[PDB]
Amino acid sequence: MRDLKTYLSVAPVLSTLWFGSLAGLLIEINRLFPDALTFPFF
Amino acid sequence: GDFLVHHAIALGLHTTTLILVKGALDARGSKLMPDKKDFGYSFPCDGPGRGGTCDISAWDAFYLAVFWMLNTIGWVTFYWHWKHITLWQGNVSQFNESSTYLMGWLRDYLWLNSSQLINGYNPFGMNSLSVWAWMFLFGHLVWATGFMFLISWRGYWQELIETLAWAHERTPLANLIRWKDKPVALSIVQARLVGLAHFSVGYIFTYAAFLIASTSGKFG
Amino acid sequence: EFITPGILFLYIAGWIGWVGRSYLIAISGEKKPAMKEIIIDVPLASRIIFRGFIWPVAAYREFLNGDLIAKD
Amino acid sequence: EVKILVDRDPIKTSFEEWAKPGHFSRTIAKGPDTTTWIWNLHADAHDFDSHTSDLEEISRKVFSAHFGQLSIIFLWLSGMYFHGARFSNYEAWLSDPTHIGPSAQVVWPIVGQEILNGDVGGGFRGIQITSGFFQIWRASGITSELQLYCTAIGALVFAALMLFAGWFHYHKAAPKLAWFQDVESMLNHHLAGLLGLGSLSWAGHQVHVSLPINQFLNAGVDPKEIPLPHEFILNRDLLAQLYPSFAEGATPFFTLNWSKYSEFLTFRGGLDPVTGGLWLTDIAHHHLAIAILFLIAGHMYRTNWGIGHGIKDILEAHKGPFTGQGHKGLYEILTTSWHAQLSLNLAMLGSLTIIVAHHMYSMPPYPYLATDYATQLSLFTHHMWIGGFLIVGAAAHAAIFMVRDYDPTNRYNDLLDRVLRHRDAIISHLNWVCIFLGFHSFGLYIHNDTMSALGRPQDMFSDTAIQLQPVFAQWIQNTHALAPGVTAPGETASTSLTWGGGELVAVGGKVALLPIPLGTADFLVHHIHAFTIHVTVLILLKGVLFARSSRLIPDKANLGFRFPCDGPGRGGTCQVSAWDHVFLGLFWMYNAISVVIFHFSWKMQSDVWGSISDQGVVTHITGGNFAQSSITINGWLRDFLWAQASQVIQSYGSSLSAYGLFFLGAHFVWAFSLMFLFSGRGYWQELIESIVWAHNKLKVAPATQPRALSIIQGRAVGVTHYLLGGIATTWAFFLARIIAVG
Amino acid sequence: RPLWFASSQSLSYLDGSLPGDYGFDPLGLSDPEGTGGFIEPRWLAYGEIINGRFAMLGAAGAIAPEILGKAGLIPAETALPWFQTGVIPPAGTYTYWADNYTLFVLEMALMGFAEHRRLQDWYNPGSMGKQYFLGLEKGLAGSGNPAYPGGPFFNPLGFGKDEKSLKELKLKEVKNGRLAMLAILGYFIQGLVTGVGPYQNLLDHLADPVNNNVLTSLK
Amino acid sequence: DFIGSSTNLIMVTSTTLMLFAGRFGLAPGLQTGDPAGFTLADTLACGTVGHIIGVGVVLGLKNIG
């Protein structure tokens, strides 16, 4: 869709998409590996 | 907790240093005002043009750095006084388990140690810490009055005192009395100074009252 | 406790800055390069994002080649 | 005549204007030269009077924007009804609405935040809500999550409906100025149809749904084995057994034999003793009578036929003893300025919100609202803040009218000219009464502090000292305690029990509004309230009147409504704009409403809210310490701020830890605001140019040039963070305290 | 020229150009200046005609199962009122060969094919004779007026070849349709106020007209 | 209802007297066949106001007397 990809390219729409994806990533990581205080995998 | 508050102290020193060094090195001029040396140390601004030049002087940098300085010394002295009042009481474990999170500083230091202070005068009597409770509230009052001069700026006050001058020149039995000095509002840089003076007086008096009353209400 | 996470920070953080810097160099030569700051070229940004995967060697070499510091 | 007056397809629906940002103006639809472009984009985002200089396009824009706001409110309502359906203990609250905390929010167990799901009661772990929505739903006779779910789907339907309506009334078929400028029809419809038939249909709901179901729940009935509302409609024997007045039908109504309808439309004054709310028979009669009233009121103005009034015909023919030759030209400014109407409507809507708070704390209309002290405190606090904010917006938009939409050449008014002429007398006398009020209220507090600190409690201003008794408010309480016996014999009990008498409507181990006494402290704090209100009025009315010209800047209307200053000259003009006056009136509205809600919370926690014993003596939360500690600022610091903020700091544990956290963070953001209010753009621009040097030295220079915030934007960010942090501090404090004690 | 509650503005667009122009527009719905959406003087004419036709079917198909059912001619099972047929499940339900929601999907699909075509003929009248709709689009093309298509399918007989007879028939159509719309309003309000069928209401009013309308809001 | 009663009489007379006060009296497009004005809107207006007066007087009579 022309000019919708330009709107979704705009800084707030793109920032909310990036930070929603990133926050879901961090959230699911903390579900998978909750309560982390060390990196023991070396 | 000592690590964390030492890094808060480092933040305070580095930031006060930043403000002051930036005002000292941008005292002669910057890209926003390269002719600042021609305006002296203390001047209000350079007008709304060029985006806006509020608080551009090196004096203004000093004036903001006094805020960050009082914050820094408040941190170093809160740290000192709580570590030492917990040492003197006996429960160093209190500080060691409570200095790592800020609700420990708000509960176990500011709220806890200020009981005997604010009870310096209650409705059913008073004690020797009544003067420190009164000075505590006095320092609160002037620390808040400085916010009038810092937040509220000129222009509102000149256009208020214009109405007051109208009223004095048109109030019967007070046309008899007339000023010799035309009552203008405070100047801008002056009012930053006056707000900073009320702010610092209140900071200092409040913390003196709290630190003496709490440390003299129990004496360790 | 600190260093194995810390490197894992400086990698990821240095990913970000090496990406957003590289993007800023890739849209530096446009006519009005400010309308790509607020409207991010998703193809260009996606090409630039994984350039910062192995960012440390790129930053190292650009420090040795002098391309890391502008010469004014 | 009042035609339909719309046009087809004025604006093409497309994402082309989604792409180019800041399309709506001349200086923003070019692209960012700097980073000020984005702040000026968001700032002028809804400044429709700046985009297009005609009332037609402006009016279409605000109409469809109101549709978007209505879609948002319907979506929010759908959310609340749905969270009450699937994520709530509403059934368990209905079963025991005295020991089950109203909860309609559950958190996800991810990073330890699951402890915010507290033991609210009813086999449910969640956040105790304070919106009083459960009380509304018991006042509506819901008694099932299916009903909340289906009205949530209905509110989503209405949100989609309002969004489609905004799209239709901007992009596909939009009205023109002949549709908005006619206001006799708008008033007639919003009175007879919105508010008239709205109250009529709510009275119909109550008469047909709320009264029977609430009578069943009050009699004691499990909400599962309670008959549905449609069973009350259809099965006439059932509702007739509830109220035999229904057995006769509407021939009571149409033969005007309404005396037999007094089984379900009573004038039974006071509160329901079984549940602590108002009598829903009284509320049904209320909404019915209000419906008749607004229905006869909405046939007042002339729209299309011969009968009615012209608002122009009223205002231009309203001579009187004090400047009645004026009022001519107000129909012109109000039908050609959205900012005038916005100012007036915001003033009255915020004052109504405050009236709402004051009438909901004292005449609790929902069942089991008065004993959910969190609900009462939160509602009063909320609607007080909303009213103060809306009044300050009335200021902002009065000022924007005065600058932009004010032309003495075309649209002239005698009254507004007379106000602008003697405006210095206005602001001078208001400044004087502000100083007088500050002294003879806060200086009374300071005298009390000094005397109590000097060991002279006999010299304080208290009931055990020099007494400043509110004789007038006490006399009003004495009258209204005795009103229903002589002046209003139709009422068996007074309109409220805050007046006086042997009335204390406890529903369980909780008070729910015993008679509030008025002592010296109430005089003192009411004069503090008059004081803070008068100073807010000073600042705001001063910005309004001096929005155009003054003795300092006689060309301020050419500088704009929202400009920083006119430079350091004339001594300094730093906050001379009307925008700066609303920005300061925001701080003073904050001070005003904060001391108002402090008065409220302490007065109720000391004199009203508490437990009731099996012997018949009430034990309040704080313990009646308002008459002796709320005369000194040290008592507000000690017996109120230090004492009641123990539950927010001996939180960090069970559910209220968030309120603990939101305490400190709010404490922060307020202080974070002080970075903005105290400082100025010049220092931050120079710091930013040093940082820009640091970025140019790494080829990471941005193209959107970093600029420090605009001066006005620094002040806006400051007052914004200041209000947020202070209000969120007070919100955390209030909710933690009152959820942890009552 | 017969005017029933005409106004000063109603005699500015309802001159003679519509079937039934008695000038009755006191509210001012069909004013041509400043129009859009569905408040249009052409769309409102179309809506009058269509609601009148559907109301004629409703009126002579809702009392028909009771005009007959109280005279024989059908089983008493298939002799329900207009509201005890499943269209008000609170008030009544008949069991057909399908449940009522399958029949609603039937109504929706078949009427969708029947009326989206009508709508696209309202937008561009030349259409509905150009796409292969099983060859029966030959009759669905001829429109002239949008509300009076008059093709082999809808107007097989002439019935108004000349404009005088067609005008008189259009007048008869809209007048019988307004009567049927008032009749449907009477059906709804009578079923709401009595809970029985309209033919029961007629028989109760005719035989011994006692408590004709005195039973206000009583079932 | 119950035609002939007091509640009917002092309501009918109020409605008709308001229609008269609008027709030939001090009280006040839509071209009716009426000699002098008094359109359908004016008729409904006088009927509404006469019903207001009628409800008021019948309920003031039912309150006392």
Ligand code: CLA
């Ligand atoms: C700046 C100060 C600071 C620091 C150092 C930390 C540090 C931490 N916090 Mg705290 N926190 C902070 C501020 C801070 N927080 C603030 C401000 C808040 C309030 C908003 C919180 C609120 C908070 C909560 C509520 C919780 C934490 C938790 C944690 C831990 C995170 C565990 C985790 O999920 O990471 C795991 C690691 C990641 C998410 C990073 C993954 C990155 C991706 C997958 C890429 C990595 C791979 C990459 C491709 C490279 C591979 C190499 C090669 C093959 C290419 C950690 C000890 C959590 C915890 O366990 O408590 C101790 C927890 O529950 N914090």
Ligand code: CLA
């Ligand atoms: C998807 C359908 C659609 C499309 C393509 C358009 C397209 C357009 N509209 Mg229309 N509009 C629509 C739906 C649509 N509109 C609806 C549903 C409404 C009713 C609210 C309107 C009301 C409307 C008005 C009143 C105006 C336009 C205008 C415009 C043009 C400019 C759009 C722009 O830059 O703003 C893009 C803006 C956004 C995408 C922001 C969305 C804001 C939504 C409504 C509220 C969201 C708030 C959120 C819940 C709260 C914030 C939370 C956050 C902090 C997390 C453009 C031609 C303008 C125009 O042409 O005049 C010159 C104009 O003045 N539109």
Ligand code: CLA
């Ligand atoms: C008796 C009819 C009637 C009713 C009920 C309303 C009701 C309303 N109008 Mg008003 N309006 C009317 C006639 C009416 N109007 C007329 C005749 C005009 C022209 C003079 C206007 C001009 C007007 C303007 C210019 C604005 C409003 C606004 C509003 C809304 C204010 C928000 C509110 O209180 O939310 C309460 C919310 C509800 C009751 C929910 C609404 C749900 C229903 C579906 C809509 C109400 C009926 C509506 C008239 C639509 C009729 C059907 C439609 C298909 C034609 C409110 C819904 C303002 C608004 O919010 O903008 C959208 C606004 O800006 N109206």
Ligand code: CLA
């Ligand atoms: C009916 C309510 C109403 C309406 C319709 C308007 C409409 C308008 N106002 Mg008015 N205003 C209102 C209420 C209202 N206001 C109130 C209650 C106040 C008192 C605070 C003001 C104070 C006010 C001022 C002082 C000014 C306006 C201005 C404007 C115009 C442009 C606003 C704009 O583009 O910002 C678009 C929206 C934003 C920029 C967003 C604002 C962000 C808010 C402040 C943050 C708070 C959000 C939340 C509570 C905090 C948590 C957030 C979370 C994410 C962390 C527009 C005509 C301006 C104007 O006309 O100047 C020419 C202007 O200068 N208004």
Ligand code: CLA
């Ligand atoms: C506690 C802090 C504080 C105090 C005391 C004041 C005091 C005042 N403000 Mg300010 N203001 C403040 C904070 C404060 N402000 C902040 C933070 C803002 C941020 C926006 C503002 C913004 C602001 C505006 C915008 C306005 C005011 C106004 C006022 C005055 C109204 C009350 C008055 O004169 O009554 C009498 C004085 C007081 C109540 C002040 C306290 C004095 C007490 C009662 C005792 C005095 C003792 C006595 C004189 C003995 C002195 C000692 C002796 C040795 C000489 C007063 C000068 C208004 C004004 O000036 O016009 C009337 C006005 O328009 N203020």
Ligand SMILES: CC1=C(C/C=C(\C)CCC[C@H](C)CCC[C@H](C)CCCC(C)C)C(=O)c2ccccc2C1=O
């Ligand atoms: C702190 C301060 C500033 C500096 C404040 C800055 C410039 C505004 C804050 C801007 C934010 C931090 C920009 C970054 C947000 C971008 C959208 C980038 C997002 C990308 C990542 C960071 C997520 C002023 O300019 C100022 C002006 C006048 C009076 C007082 C003050 C004042 O107190």
Ligand code: SF4
């Ligand atoms: S607001 Fe005051 S300090 Fe800022 S530019 Fe204007 S005159 Fe100078």
